[PDB]
């Protein structure tokens with residue numbers, strides 16, 4: 066579990082969105098596993114605006130923050146899970162690292178701020194849904 070709080074927005078994994086998130090929906094994309102909803106109070110997270118390929122992510126199944134190298138956002142085939150059938154997930158970055166289903170929502174951060182959240186993984190890998198291209202998160 067986990068979320069990004071930026072301005073008047075809440076960024077969560079789409080498969081973990083609550084009834085409040087859907088009722089207060091701003092934007093969602095099933096192929097990216099992302100959902101953004103409106104908030105009453107302001108958040109303090111800063112979204113990175115960069116092309117960094119090194120950062121640190123939080124792994125709840127280990128209670129640890131790991132330094133990782135990751136690929137640039139891409140269209141990647143992701144196997145069937147409890148939440149989605151086997152499909153191509155877009156804007157996805159991969160790193161070699163530990164991850165379990167309940168690790169989704171763990172933040173990946175670089176020196177510039179939040180890069181994304183844990184969205185896919187298994188077999189020694191971890192995948193993160195990029196949020197650095199969502200420029201509108203920084204305004205209105």
Ligand SMILES: COCC(=O)Nc1c(Cl)cc(C)cc1Oc1cccc(C(N)=O)c1
Nearest residue numbers: 098143146148149164165166184185186187
């Ligand atoms: C057979 O793999 C099922 C599974 O739950 N693997 C998995 C494992 Cl180990 C680890 C993680 C972090 C995610 C994982 O899968 C999911 C779960 C929720 C959503 C998505 C998606 N966005 O397509 C992918």
Ligand SMILES: [Zn+2]
Nearest residue numbers: 115117175177
């Ligand atoms: Zn950066």
